[PDB]
């Protein structure tokens, strides 16, 4: 399996799925739902990025998430051919 989506909490790697695939040289991201990653009893070495949009439209606020918060555009800098961590 690919983990190409993560707007439905827990179905991709950061505080998890990460132990079972990833690296300290991974790259992911959160959205939707998603960003309920940055808020569990784990860690990531792979750079994680919660969608600060996404995450305000879940009612958190900025301080809420161990995980920055970057835009929709700082994800999409990480992809650019890389295309096997999306969602």
């Known amino acids: 399996m ?12 950061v505080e998890k799925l990460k132990i079972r695939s990833a690296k300290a040289e991974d790259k ?3 959205i939707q739902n998603g960003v309920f990653w940055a808020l ?4 990531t070495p792979a750079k994680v990025y ?5 995450f305000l439209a879940r009612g958190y606020s900025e301080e809420d ?12 800098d990480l992809l650019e051919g890389e295309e096997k961590f999306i969602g």
Do not use: M, N, Q, R
């Open 2 to 13: 690919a983990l190409v989506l993560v707007k439905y909490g827990t179905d991709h790697p």
């Open 65 to 76: 998430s161990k995980v920055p918060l970057i835009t929709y555009s700082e994800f999409i």
């Open 40 to 43: 569990e009893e784990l860690e």
């Open 50 to 54: 919660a969608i600060k949009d996404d």
């Open 28 to 30: 992911i991201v959160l």
